[PDB]
From Swiss-Prot, chains A, B:
Expression sites (tissue/organ): Expressed in heart, kidney, liver, lung, pancreas, placenta, spleen and testis. Not expressed in brain, skeletal muscle, colon, ovary, prostate, small intestine and thymus. Expressed in colon and ovary cancer cell lines while it is not expressed in the respective normal tissues.
Function: Methyllysine-binding protein, component of the MOF histone acetyltransferase protein complex. Not required for maintaining the global histone H4 'Lys-16' acetylation (H4K16ac) levels or locus specific histone acetylation, but instead works downstream in transcriptional regulation of MOF target genes. As part of the NSL complex it may be involved in acetylation of nucleosomal histone H4 on several lysine residues. Contributes to methyllysine-dependent p53/TP53 stabilization and up-regulation after DNA damage.
Lineage: Eukaryota, Metazoa, Chordata, Craniata, Vertebrata
Subunit structure and binding partners: Homodimer; disulfide-linked. Component of some MLL1/MLL complex, at least composed of the core components KMT2A/MLL1, ASH2L, HCFC1, WDR5 and RBBP5, as well as the facultative components BACC1, CHD8, E2F6, HSP70, INO80C, KANSL1, LAS1L, MAX, MCRS1, MGA, KAT8/MOF, PELP1, PHF20, PRP31, RING2, RUVB1/TIP49A, RUVB2/TIP49B, SENP3, TAF1, TAF4, TAF6, TAF7, TAF9 and TEX10. Component of the NSL complex at least composed of MOF/KAT8, KANSL1, KANSL2, KANSL3, MCRS1, PHF20, OGT1/OGT, WDR5 and HCFC1.
Further information: Antibodies against PHF20 are present in sera from patients with hepatocellular carcinoma, glioblastoma and childhood medulloblastula.
Parent-protein start and end of this portion: 4 to 69 of 1012
Domain notes: The Tudor domain 2 mediates reading of dimethyl-lysine residues. The Tudor domain 1 doesn't bind dimethyl-lysine residues, due to an atypical and occluded aromatic cage.
Protein's gene: PHF20
PTMs per UniProt: Ubiquitinated by TRIM26; leading to proteasomal degradation.
Subcellular compartments: Nucleus
Domain Tudor: 1-66
Name of the featured protein: PHD finger protein 20
Protein source organism: Homo sapiens
Superkingdom of this protein's organism: Eukaryota
Length: 66, 66
């Protein structure tokens, strides 16, 4: 089950911020949810979908967009 | 002629930071130079080249990467 974290909604189309591979906090959204392994597919706004990434929904590298 | 600005080299393949369409300072590079209109083609690292942009080489929306 997705965890209850402030400012974040674990839903496809939900907006948040994630820390990218270049160690930059950038605006992102949830493209898909893997309820079995507890992961969220993250898409960094205006990036090649080649760099979309799966983050454990408990990752501290995810934060509210506000 | 390109201007002389600290930390920035007006050369194809040169690295810097530019302020993107989402008002975020993000690492970028010079893909091309237009010496007639005094513009630089900017590519934001890991983005769709659809969002590469021409910036006047005097733009304050360009800054050194350091």
């Amino acid at each position: 089950h997705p965890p209850n974290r402030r400012g974040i909604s674990f839903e496809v189309g939900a907006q948040l911020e994630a820390r990218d591979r270049l160690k930059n906090w950038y605006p992102a959204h949830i493209e898909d949810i893997d309820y079995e392994e507890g992961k969220v597919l993250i898409h960094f706004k205006r990036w090649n979908h080649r760099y979309d990434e799966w983050f454990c929904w408990d990752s501290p590298y995810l934060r509210p967009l506000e």
